[PDB]
Amino acid sequence: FDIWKNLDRIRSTKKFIKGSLLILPMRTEDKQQFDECMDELHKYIILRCYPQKEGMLFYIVLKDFNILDSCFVLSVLLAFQKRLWMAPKNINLTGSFYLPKNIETGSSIVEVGFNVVPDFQQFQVKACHVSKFMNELSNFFSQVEFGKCEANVINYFKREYNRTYSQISLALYELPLIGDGLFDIKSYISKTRPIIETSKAQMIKHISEMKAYNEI
Amino acid sequence: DKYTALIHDENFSTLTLNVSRYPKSLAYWEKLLNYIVKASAPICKSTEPQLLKLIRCTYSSMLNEFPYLENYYIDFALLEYKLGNVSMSHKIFQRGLQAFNQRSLLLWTSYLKFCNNVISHQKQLFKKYETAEEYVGLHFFSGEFWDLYLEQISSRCTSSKKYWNVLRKILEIPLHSFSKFYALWLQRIDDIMDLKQLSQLTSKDELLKKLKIDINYSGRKGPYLQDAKKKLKKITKEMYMVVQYQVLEIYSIFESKIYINYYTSPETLVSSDEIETWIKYLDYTITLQTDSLTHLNFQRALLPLAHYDLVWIKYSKWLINSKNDLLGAKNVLLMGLKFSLKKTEIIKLLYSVICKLNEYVLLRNLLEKIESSYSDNVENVDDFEIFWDYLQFKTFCQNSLYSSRYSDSQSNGLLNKELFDKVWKRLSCKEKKSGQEILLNNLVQFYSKDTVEFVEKNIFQKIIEFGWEYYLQNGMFWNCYCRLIYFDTSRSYLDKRQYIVRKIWPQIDKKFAQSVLPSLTEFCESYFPEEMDTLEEMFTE
Amino acid sequence: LENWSRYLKFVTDPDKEFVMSVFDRCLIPCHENTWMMYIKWLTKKNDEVVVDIYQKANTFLFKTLRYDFLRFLKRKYRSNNTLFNNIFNETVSRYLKIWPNDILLMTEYLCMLKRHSFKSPKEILEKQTSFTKILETSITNYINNQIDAKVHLQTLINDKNLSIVVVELIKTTWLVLKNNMQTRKYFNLYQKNILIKNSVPFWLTYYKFEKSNVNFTKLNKFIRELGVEIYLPTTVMNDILTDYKTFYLTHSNIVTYESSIIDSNTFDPILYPELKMSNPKYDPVDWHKKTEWKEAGHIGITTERPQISNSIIECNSGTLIQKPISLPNFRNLEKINQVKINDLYTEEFLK
Amino acid sequence: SQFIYPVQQQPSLNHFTDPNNTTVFIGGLSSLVTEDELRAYFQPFGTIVYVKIPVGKCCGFVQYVDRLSAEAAIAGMQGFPIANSRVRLSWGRSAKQTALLQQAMLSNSQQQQPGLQQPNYGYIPSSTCEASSTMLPGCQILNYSNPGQQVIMQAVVNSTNAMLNRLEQGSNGFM
Amino acid sequence: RDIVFVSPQLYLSSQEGWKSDSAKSGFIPILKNDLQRFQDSL
Amino acid sequence: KVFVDANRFDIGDLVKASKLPQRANESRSRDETCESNPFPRLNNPKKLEPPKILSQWSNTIPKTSIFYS
C-alpha cells in the first residue's frame, strides 16, 4: 500500500547500469494535476520530463539509475495513471515502458512482439499488483545490461513517436472521406463496374448450378 | 533551366492538380512519376539541384503515402544511389524495412545485394545478414535470399566451417527451392574426403554416439570413408523426407492457389477464392507455433490483402488469443487503422483492446480525434456503426469521469444533457439518417425510478407532443415505449396496466394497422392477453 | 396444375359457391397455396364455413397453412367461445403428432389460454396468482410424471416445451407482483435439470431479468460460463454477447471494470465478448500430439506430419555457430502418405 | 537433370478429398433439435445454402457457401453438445449424391460440387447477411442472401435491427 | 522556389498548416497557382 | 523499373553500354503504370510453378496427394 515501504522491502531483498536508459510516455489529459504531482516527485528525489504539444505527451527518461531509484519511480507513475480514473492498496497498474533494444537479457512484464516504434523493444506490463510488480521489475532489471547509444536519442524518439501517431491522426482524419474524395471514384467505377457485374453473374450462375446439384 | 522549364510546362501543372486532388489514386501518381523523371535528363550530379530535391520529395510523399511499395522503395533508393549519397540510400532502405516492420524479402534481397557492394567490414556485414536471417529467412519463397547468403559466405571466409553451419541450417527450413540447397549439400558431402572434417560437418561426440563413425581411425580409411559418406546419406534422406513432405504440403494446399503477392494499389480488388486461400494459410501457420514464420506470414499476407480488414483483425485476434502479448495487438491494430478502408470493425476492436489495456487517456484522446475528424457532428454520418461504437465508448469513458448525477439510480448511462443533445440530434432526423430505432432500445433498457420518469418525460413525451411521422408510425417505438415502462422496479402491476392502456391510446387512434398493429400486437400478446382483447377492440373500430 | 391455375384465375376474374366447388374439385386433384387462396376468396366473400374449410384443410394436409389457420382463427376470436374450443382441438391435434415438439405454437396456446380463462384489483390479484398456480403445479407434475385430466397440462410437456412453460412461469411471477425471490428460487431450481438448461428462452429471460437487476457480477458469471456450460445457439450467443457489450458500456464505469477485471488469469468483460464473438468452445488461460495439429490446415484428415526433433529453425546463425551442431532426431518418419479419417459420416449415416 | 517437377497420384473422391464440399455433417443430433435450430446454430459462421435432416436418424446436413465457413464450423463445433449430448462433425457428401450413394450400395459400386469458377473480386468469405454503390475494397460489395436465395449488394444496421427484434421476441417463442 | 507542398487530408480535416513550402513529410507538390486545386475539392 | 535489368539507374547505363556492336543483320520500360494491368486475374496468369525435387530421392515422395486439382 506504501511505495517507499516496498522500495525499502526490496532494498533489503535484492542485494547502476553502464549506459542505462528508460523512456516512458505518459498521457494524462489533465496536464496541470500531472505537473502538480510530477514536480512533487522531483522535489522528493536523472528523470528528465520532456513535453510535446489535453494529450500531454510527457516523456520520463531514466539515466544511470541505481535499480531501486527506478523501482520507486515507475510504480508511482503507473499508480498515478489509474488514480485519476478510479477514485482521486486497491486496484493495480497496467501500462508500458520502453527500452532501446540494445540489450542482452541473460509473466507480468513481457517483450512486446511487434513494436510500432523503430528500435525500441516495447515492454508491456501486465495486471500484477504493486508488490509483485515491484519484485518482477527489480528481478528483470537485475537481468538486463545495455550498450551506450546516447545520441540525444529522445530527440529521435520524439520524432518517431509523433510521426507514427500523427500518421494515425492522418488515417483518422481520412475516416470521413474514405473513397469519395481521397481517390478518384469515377475513373475507379469505370473499371470496377463491369467486373463486379461479371462476378454477380458468375455467382448467380453458380447458385443456379448449386440448385441443380442440390435438388432432385 | 530545365527545372524552371519543367515548372512552366502546363502538362506538369494539370497533372499535378489531378494528383493533389486525389492522394490514393495510384494511376494519377504514376503519371506524376513518369512525367517528372522521363521529362528530366539522364540523372546525374550535373542535373539541377532543385530538380533533384523535387524527385526526392516526390518519392518521399509517395512512399509515405503508400507504405507497402517494395519496388518504389528500390526505385527511390537506387535512383538516390546513382547520384551518390550512399549513406542516404542506407537510410532509405532502412526506412523501407521499418515500414515493413523489418520483413517481406524483396526489400531484403535487394538491400542486401546492394549491401554486398557497399559495405566492406566483414563481421558487421555478416551480422547484417544475421539480423536479416532471423526476420525473413524462414520465408517460403526466400530461396534467393539464402542463395545470396550462401554464395557470399563461400566468397569471404577461408574456413568452410561457417558455411557448413548455414547449410545445416537451410535444410531444416521449409523453403520453396529447398532442393537447390540439398543438391549443394549432397555435392558437399560427396566432396569431403579427408575424414577429419566430419568434425566440422557436425559435432564429434554426436557423430560418434548417434551415428557411429570415429574420426580418429588407424586403418586404411578408404572403405571407412566410403561407408561414412554412404551412412550420412541415409540421415540426409530422412531430413529430406521430412522437409520435402512439409514443402509439398505447403505447395499443394496453399501456394498453388495464391496468385498475387505484391500489393497493387488500394484501388485493386482481390478474388474470393484467393482470400479463401490466404485465411486458411494464416490459420495453418498458427498451428506450427514457429513464431518468426507466423509473424512473417501475417505480415506477408498483409501485402496484397493490405487493407481489407480481414487480415488485420485476424492478426489481432491471433495475438490476443494465442501468443498473449495483448499490447502488440493494440499496436498492429493501430497500424491497420493506419489503412483499412472499412475502418469500422477495426476501430471497434481497437476500442475494446485498449479498454482491456486500461489506457483510457488514449481512448479519450482517440475519441475526441474522431470528433475533430468528422470536424464535429458525428450524428450526420451515413454509416451508423461508427457513431454507434463511438457513442458507446464515449459514454463509457464519459460517465466514468463525471458521474453521480442521478441519485439512487446511478449508472450515469447515456444521459449527459450534452450527450442527450447528441443522441437527440441523431434521433431528430426523421428517416434522413438510418438506424434511428437502435438508440431507443438502449435508452429503454435504462430502468428503475427517477429516470424512467425522466427518459419518458424527456425523450418520449417530446416525441409524443411533436410526432415525426416515420418515427411515430413504426411499431418498434411503441413497443420500446411500453417496454421501458413495463420493466421498472418502482411500481406494481396495476398501474402498469392503467398506464399501458394510457400509452396505447393517445397517439395511434388512427390507421396504422399495417405498421404498429403487427409489432405492438406481438408485444401485447407477449406480456398478457387481456388488454390484447381490449386492444383489438380498439383497433377494430 | 397450369390448367387449374387458369381456372382459378378465371374464377378470380368473375355462383360463387359453384366456383368454390370447382376449386375444391381442383384441390382434390391437388396444394397448400390453393387452399390458402381459397380461404382468401372465402374471406373476400365473408366465417364459420371458412372455419369448416380450414378444419378440412388441416385434416387434408404443411406447417405454414395450419399455423396461419391458428393465427387467423385467433383474429376472429373475440366473437365467441365455440371458436375457442375449435382452435383448442385443432391445436392439440397439431401438438400431439403432426408437429411434435416445436417451440413456436405452445406460447400461442398459453396466450390463447389466459385470455379466455382469465379476464376488481384484489380480484385481478388472486386471478393472476391462481394463474401462477396453474403453471407451477404443472411443472412439478412433469417432474413427477402424473398428468391429470387437464388438456393444457397434457400439451405442456412434449420435450422442448417445458422450456416455454417455465419461461412464462418465471415471467408472470417476476413481472406481475415484484416477487423477486420465488423467481430466484425458480432459477436455482431450474438451473439443475437438464431438459430446461439448454433452452433458449429460459436463459434469455434470465438475461433480461439480470439486466433488470443491474448488478454485473451475476452477469459476468453468466457470460463467463456461457459457451462452456450453458450451451446455447450461436446466433443467440453472438446476440447475447453483443447486447451485453452494449449494455455494459451503457451502464458501467472504469472503477467497476477494473474491479471486475479478474486478476492475472482470465477474461475481461469488454474484450471477452469481442474476442469470443464466435468460437464458443473457448477457454482463457505438450505440443504436436493434439488433434488440431494433426488435422492442421488440410482440415479433412488426421495425418501424422513428420517433424524433426532438435530442429534449429528458430535459432540464428550466430548461436548456431556457437556450438557444433547435433544431428536431426526424427519424429514419426514412417507415416508418410499415411492417411487416417474418422469416416464419421459414412459409418453413422449410410450404415 | 537432378531436378524434376513432382508427380503425385490422385486419391478417391469420397467426401474429404477435393476441398469443394461445403456440406458440414453433424451426428449424434438429438430429436429436440430439428430444421430451424440447426440453422440457428450454424448461421454466424457463414451463409447457409440449406439445412436438411432425415427424421429417421440422428444426422444432419448444413451447406455453407465457402469452405472457410465450413472449416471454421468444423473447428468450432466438434464436441459441442447441442440441446443434449455431444455432436460429432465431419463433411457430409450431401444431398442427391447421397441417394446415388445408397443406390451404389445397392448396385455394389462421385461428383465434385462446383466450388466457384475463377475470381469474382466481389465476394469476401464468411460474410453474413441479414434480410448508393461506392464499391470499395472495404465495402464487400457482394453477399449471398437466403431466407428463393439471391445475390444482393450493400448494412450492419439491419443485422442490429434484426437482433434487437430477435431478442425482444427471444423471451417468448415465435422461433 | 515557386512550388508549395500541400496535403488534402489536412485541408479537408481543416487542420492548420495544410500548405508549407519546406517539405515536412508527406505533402504533395503544387505550384504557386494553388487556387484551381483549392477550388477542385469543395 | 526495378527487375527488368537496366531500368534500375544503378546498373542501368551499363547494359545499354555493354550491348555488343550489332553489325550483322538480325523491353517493358518505365512507361508501365498501375492502370496498364488493372486486374491481373482477369487475363489468366500461369500458376506458381511446382517446386523442384531431387530425382535421386524422387521415389520417396508422398504418394497420393490430398485434394486433386
UniProtKB/Swiss-Prot annotation, chain B:
In which broad location class does this protein mainly occur, judging by the first location in its UniProt entry?
Answer: nucleus
Q: How does it assemble?
A: Component of the 18S U1 snRNP particle, a subcomplex of the spliceosome.
Q: Is Nucleus among the key words of this record?
A: yes
Gene Ontology CC: commitment complex; nucleus; spliceosomal complex; U1 snRNP; U2-type prespliceosome
Q: Read off the SMART domains from this record.
A: HAT
Pfam families, per database record: HAT_PRP39_C (PF23241), HAT_PRP39_N (PF23240)
What are the recorded GO MF terms, alphabetically? RNA binding
Phylogenetic classification of the source organism: Eukaryota, Fungi, Dikarya, Ascomycota, Saccharomycotina
* Alphabetically ordered keywords of this record: mRNA processing, mRNA splicing, Nucleus, Repeat, Ribonucleoprotein, RNA-binding, Spliceosome
HAT repeats by residue range: 6-38, 50-82, 84-117, 120-155, 162-194, 254-287, 289-321, 365-396, 455-487
Q: Where is this motif: Nuclear localization signal?
A: 229-234
Under the heading Gene3D superfamilies, the entry gives: Tetratricopeptide repeat domain
Q: Where is the signal peptide?
A: none
Supply the source organism for this entry.
Saccharomyces cerevisiae (strain ATCC 204508 / S288c) (Baker's yeast)
Q: What is this protein called?
A: U1 small nuclear ribonucleoprotein component PRP42
Biological process, per Gene Ontology: mRNA 5'-splice site recognition; mRNA splicing, via spliceosome
Record localization:
Nucleus
InterPro entries xrefs:
HAT, TPR-like_helical_dom_sf
Q: Function of this protein?
A: Essential component of the U1 snRNP particle, which recognizes and binds the 5'-splice site of pre-mRNA. Together with other non-snRNP factors, U1 snRNP forms the spliceosomal commitment complex, that targets pre-mRNA to the splicing pathway. U1 snRNP is cotranscriptionally recruited to intron-containing genes. Required for U1 snRNP biogenesis.
Curated annotation (Swiss-Prot), chain C:
- Key word ATP-binding present in the record? no
Q: Which domain of life is it from?
A: Eukaryota
Would you indicate the residue range of the signal peptide? none
Keyword field: mRNA processing, mRNA splicing, Nucleus, Repeat
Primary localization class, coarse: nucleus
- Gene Ontology biological process terms in this record: mRNA 5'-splice site recognition; mRNA splicing, via spliceosome
Q: What additional remark is attached to this entry?
A: Present with 4460 molecules/cell in log phase SD medium.
Q: What does this protein do?
A: Function prior to stable branch point recognition by the U1 snRNP particle to facilitate or stabilize the U1 snRNP/5'-splice site interaction. Has a direct role in the assembly or function of a catalytically active spliceosome.
Give the family this protein belongs to, as stated in its UniProt record.
Belongs to the PRP39 family.
Q: What is this protein called?
A: Pre-mRNA-processing factor 39
Q: Which organism is it from?
A: Saccharomyces cerevisiae (strain ATCC 204508 / S288c)
- Its gene is PRP39
Swiss-Prot record, chain D:
Give the quaternary structure: Component of the U1 small nuclear ribonucleoprotein complex (U1 snRNP).
Misc remark for this entry? Answer: Present with 1480 molecules/cell in log phase SD medium.
Q: What is this protein called?
A: Protein NAM8
What is the covered span of the full protein?
292 to 521 of 523
Q: Which residues cross the membrane?
A: none
Effect of inactivating the gene: Affects the meiotic recombination and the formation of viable spores.
- Comment field on protein domains: The RNA binding domains RRM2 and RRM3 are required for NAM8 meiotic function. Within the U1 snRNP complex, the RRM2 domain of NAM8 is positioned to bind to the intronic region immediately down-stream of nucleotide +13.
Role: Component of the U1 small nuclear ribonucleoprotein complex (U1 snRNP) involved in the initiation of meiotic recombination. Involved in the formation of DSBs at recombination hot-spots through meiosis-specific splicing of REC107 pre-mRNA. Collaborates with MER1 to promote splicing of essential meiotic mRNAs REC10, AMA1, MER3, HFM1, SPO22 and PCH2. NAM8 interacts with the pre-mRNA downstream of the 5' splice site, in a region of non-conserved sequence and is required for efficient splicing of uncapped RNA precursor.
Ranges for domain RRM come to: 22-94
UniProtKB/Swiss-Prot annotation, chain F:
Q: Where in the cell is it found?
A: Nucleus
Q: Where is this region: Disordered?
A: 21-51
Q: What else is known?
A: Present with 2140 molecules/cell in log phase SD medium.
Q: How does this protein assemble? A: U1 snRNP is composed of the 7 core Sm proteins SMB1, SMD1, SMD2, SMD3, SME1, SMX3 and SMX2 (Sm proteins B, D1, D2, D3, E, F and G, respectively) that assemble in a heptameric protein ring on the Sm site of the small nuclear RNA to form the core snRNP, and at least 10 U1 snRNP-specific proteins SNP1/U1-70K, MUD1/U1-A, YHC1/U1-C, LUC7, NAM8, PRP39, PRP40, PRP42, SNU56 and SNU71. YHC1/U1-C interacts with U1 snRNA and the 5' splice-site region of the pre-mRNA.
- Describe the function of this protein: Component of the spliceosomal U1 snRNP, which is essential for recognition of the pre-mRNA 5' splice-site and the subsequent assembly of the spliceosome. YHC1/U1-C is directly involved in initial 5' splice-site recognition for both constitutive and regulated alternative splicing. The interaction with the 5' splice-site seems to precede base-pairing between the pre-mRNA and the U1 snRNA. Stimulates commitment or early (E) complex formation by stabilizing the base pairing of the 5' end of the U1 snRNA and the 5' splice-site region.
Family according to the record: Belongs to the U1 small nuclear ribonucleoprotein C family.
- Record-given protein name: U1 small nuclear ribonucleoprotein C
Source organism (scientific name): Saccharomyces cerevisiae (strain ATCC 204508 / S288c)
Q: Which gene encodes it?
A: YHC1
* Residue range from the parent sequence: 117 to 195 of 231
